[PDB]
Every structure is written in C-alpha cells, then in structure tokens.
C-alpha cells in the first residue's frame, strides 16, 4: 500500500516582494521533486534518483504547472484578504496537500485535497471526491464557487486517473528503494548519570520507511511511560533515525531489554546493553 502527496505552500511577504511559492512531492516517505519560486532558475527539480530518468517534457511541463500554480495561489492570497477583511501589510500562508493512496494491487484507495489558511483548516475534498467540507464562513464562499465551477469533478478525474497511473509508474521505476524496506541498525548505549543511576539508550539508525516501534521493557514489563522517546528524524540520506532512553537504578541494567519493530525486520528484535 502506497501514497503520492504534493505539498504546496504560498507565503505573502509585503515589503519583501511577491509571495513565495514552494511545492514538494513525496512517494510514501521519499521526497522526489521540489519547486521554489525563490530559486535562481525556478523549475521543478529531481530529489530522488529514480525520477531523474524522466525526460525534458516532464520537467518543462511540471515547471509550467508550478508557475501557473504560483500565480493562482498569489491571487488566492489576495482573495483571502478580502474574505477575512485583513490588511495588505500582514504576511499570510496558504498550505495545500493533495494526492492519492493505492493498495498493493495498485487500485485507488483514497483521494486527498485539503488546505489551511494561516495554519487553520480551510477546505477539504470529502472522501466521496464529490463534496467539500468548509471550516468557516470564508471557506463556505469558496465551497459554493467550487460547486458552481465543477472543481470536485476535475480533481476527482485527476485523483482517479493520472495520480494513480503516475504513482504506479514511480513505484515501478523506484522499486529497488521504494519497495525495499531498510531495517534499522540498532545498538544500546550506557551512560552513568551518577554512582546510583544510569541511562540506557536504544538506537535505531538508517531505516526506511519512517514507521517504527521502539520500546523498553523491565523484566518483561513495558516502560513506555518512563521512556524518553524522540521524534523520528531524517538522517539526511533518505533514511530515518530514532532512539528511546530510560534512566535505570544502577544494578538493574541487565533486566532491561529494548524491543524494535520495523517492516524491514522479519521478526521483533530484542537488545540489551552489551558491556
């Protein structure tokens, strides 16, 4: 089961020029394209090796789409000011995410299109792909305009069509990474805090995709409520890192076990501090 997601951000900045427009594209947890209007030669550009084989008509066409989208989103920022009776002196932000999820057979599971204005929910295409949920009176104005202009049907056509078709293409072209789970490299470190207590830290490094479970047990009792668990973070090389730590009484260290669950591991993994 897989996903393709585009994230567009438009940010006004009065006194500092026209609004900035940034778009990024992901397949699952892998970024594969970007566009930034503040780039020297602003264009859609590759961010994963398996999209680089796309020809110049792909890049020219995507760049065309992004420039037209930037223009429309800038218009939309101005419209939002009217809807909310806001001044042209404030900076504001539109965020939009859209895309498709497919199952293991490649059929469309779900389409997405939802947005925020200044970080608050604005309007979202419903799962039926034919109706909208509007969060406030401003978005209700948009809802009516979009019903009139048959926006949902055209979006539905994209989500059920090109979105799924191109996702399938990407998944095949990048199968050696996108459909190849990379298990974490794991180890446990030990750090005395005093003569009476120590930190045990369980590391999971270089894994893909991001979803993982990292837990400490004491005598086979779960310690999640006593565990410091950091947010999963990008390694910088398209893989991820995470760790979980517990402070333990000196002498109890061999009673603690770290448990790692990940798609790239055939079985639950169990680790201890190896002195």
């Amino acid at each position: 089961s897989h996903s393709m997601r585009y994230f567009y951000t438009a940010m006004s900045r009065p006194g500092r020029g026209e609004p900035r427009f940034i778009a990024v594209g992901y397949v699952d947890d892998t970024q594969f394209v970007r566009f930034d209007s503040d780039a020297a030669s602003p264009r859609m550009a590759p961010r994963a090796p398996w999209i680089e084989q796309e020809g110049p008509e792909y890049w020219d066409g995507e760049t065309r789409n992004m420039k037209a989208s930037a223009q429309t989103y800038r218009e939309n920022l101005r419209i939002a000011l009217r809807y909310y009776n806001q001044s042209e002196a404030g900076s504001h932000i539109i965020q939009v995410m859209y895309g498709c999820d497919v199952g293991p057979d490649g059929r469309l599971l779900r389409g997405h299109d939802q947005s925020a204005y200044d970080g608050k929910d604005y309007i979202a295409l419903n799962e039926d792909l034919s109706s909208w949920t509007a969060a406030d009176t401003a978005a209700q104005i948009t809802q009516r305009k979009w019903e009139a202009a048959r926006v949902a049907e055209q979006l539905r056509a994209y989500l059920e069509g090109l979105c799924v078709e191109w996702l399938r293409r990407y998944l095949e072209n990048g199968k050696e990474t996108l459909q190849r789970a990379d298990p974490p490299k794991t180890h446990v470190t030990h750090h005395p805090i005093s003569d009476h207590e120590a930190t045990l830290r369980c590391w999971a490094l270089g894994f893909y995709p991001a979803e993982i479970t990292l837990t400490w047990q004491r005598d086979g009792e779960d310690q999640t409520q006593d565990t410091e668990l950091v947010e999963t973070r990008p390694a910088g090389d398209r893989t991820f890192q995470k760790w979980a730590a517990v402070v333990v009484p000196s002498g109890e260290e061999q009673r603690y076990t770290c448990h790692v669950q990940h798609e790239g591991l055939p079985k639950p993994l169990t680790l201890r501090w190896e002195p």
């Binding site: 037209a68 429309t72 419209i79 948009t142 202009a149 926006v151 055209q154 090109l162 979105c163």
Partner: peptide, 10 residues
C-alpha cells in the same frame, strides 16, 4: 505528476 488544474481561485 502534479495536477494540470492550475486555474482554481478560492
């Protein structure tokens, strides 16, 4: 591939 619906005003 991004959508070619690029004209939509709110």
């Amino acid at each position: 591939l991004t959508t070619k619906l690029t004209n939509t005003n709110i």
